[PDB]
Structure 1
Amino acid sequence: TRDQNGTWEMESNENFEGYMKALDIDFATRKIAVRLTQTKVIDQDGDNFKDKTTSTFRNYDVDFTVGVEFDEYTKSLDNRHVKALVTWEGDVLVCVQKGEKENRGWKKWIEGDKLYLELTCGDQVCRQVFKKK
């Protein structure tokens, strides 16, 4: 069939590294690119094609119990060992990541259909907002 319509989920990617290197993509970008999987959405009408490709990385699962300190390796980030303790302050979930970095942790709460996440490290604060799907 010439019909390539559909949503296509990558299952295999062989020698992406060699192809990217032939294109002169730099080492640090290749190190990340070889871990992604693509989803390809093809809209085909005759000989007219529209291809919309997204690349995804699965970060590592984080499982914890509130009040139980646990060892965390931040492999999706700076790859450091921290001792994390999550507690409730009202409806706000508060995490202290005890380790080399001062004032490292996060706070997480719901307001309406939005999830708020504030990440801290030193004097830096990152504010993220998520919509319920």
Structure 2
Amino acid sequence: MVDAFLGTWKLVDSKNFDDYMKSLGVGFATRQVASMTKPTTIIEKNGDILTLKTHSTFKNTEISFKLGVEFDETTADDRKVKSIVTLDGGKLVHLQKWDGQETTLVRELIDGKLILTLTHGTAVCTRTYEKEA
């Protein structure tokens, strides 16, 4: 059910990312670098285990998880969160919880592009990724 998300994806559009980062308390200097970074996201599957890599000239992350099973995560901005990823309406929904706060990272395929919607507080960011061959 996750299979159309798998592969290597490159950032090609970003809307409201500074709002999202600011809502999370990211400092201005980090926001400035991040606003000019174009990550590569790699999503791979081995049986029930997904691995999601995010690579850039600034911050690099990797998580592995089973759909529907909570996992500990340390985010790129150093938040220590409780996470769960699940398919919902064909979208890959990643929920992070910490300190009573939540943020969602929702991935949906639209016309072959991967649209990542990031919500925290009132901030809603949309990032578009295109598949690499």
**In 2, Cα distance between equivalents of 1:95 and 1:127:** 15
**In 2, Cα distance between equivalents of 1:132 and 1:69:** 28
Deviation at 1:96, TM superposition (A): 1.3
Q: Which has the larger radius of gyration?
A: 1
User: Would the aligned equivalents of 1:101 and 1:122 in 2 still touch at CA under 8 Å?
Assistant: no
**In 1, Cα distance between equivalents of 2:64 and 2:81:** 14
Percent of aligned pairs with the same residue? Answer: 41
**In 2, Cα distance between equivalents of 1:122 and 1:57:** 25
Deviation at 1:58, TM superposition (A): 5.1
User: Using a 3 Å threshold, how does the CA distance of structure 1 residues 132 and 101 change in structure 2: closer, same or farther?
Assistant: farther
User: Would the aligned equivalents of 1:88 and 1:94 in 2 still touch at CA under 8 Å?
Assistant: yes
**Paired residue for 1:57?**
58
**In 2, Cα distance between equivalents of 1:57 and 1:65:** 27
Deviation at 1:101, TM superposition (A): 5.8
User: Would the aligned equivalents of 1:69 and 1:85 in 2 still touch at CA under 8 Å?
Assistant: yes
**Paired residue for 2:126?**
127
The higher relative CO (CA closer than 8 Å, separation ≥ 6) is in 2
**In 2, Cα distance between equivalents of 1:58 and 1:118:** 19
Question: What CA RMSD, in Å, does the superposition of the two structures yield over aligned residues?
Answer: 2.2
Name the aligned partner's letter for residue 100 of structure 1.
D
**Paired residue for 1:108?**
107
**Paired residue for 2:69?**
68
**Paired residue for 2:83?**
84
**Paired residue for 1:94?**
93
**In 2, Cα distance between equivalents of 1:66 and 1:97:** 14
**In 1, Cα distance between equivalents of 2:72 and 2:102:** 17
Q: C-alpha offsets along residues 62-119 of structure 1, whole Å, 9 cap, x if unaligned?
A: 2111101000111x22x11110011111211112111126331211111222000011
User: Using a 3 Å threshold, how does the CA distance of structure 1 residues 131 and 64 change in structure 2: closer, same or farther?
Assistant: same
Runs (5+) with no aligned partner, structure 2 = 1-28, 34-55
Give structure 1 regions of 4+ aligned residues with deviation exceeding 4 angstroms.
Answer: none
**In 1, Cα distance between equivalents of 2:66 and 2:120:** 22
**Paired residue for 1:8?**
none
Runs (5+) with no aligned partner, structure 1 = 1-27, 33-54
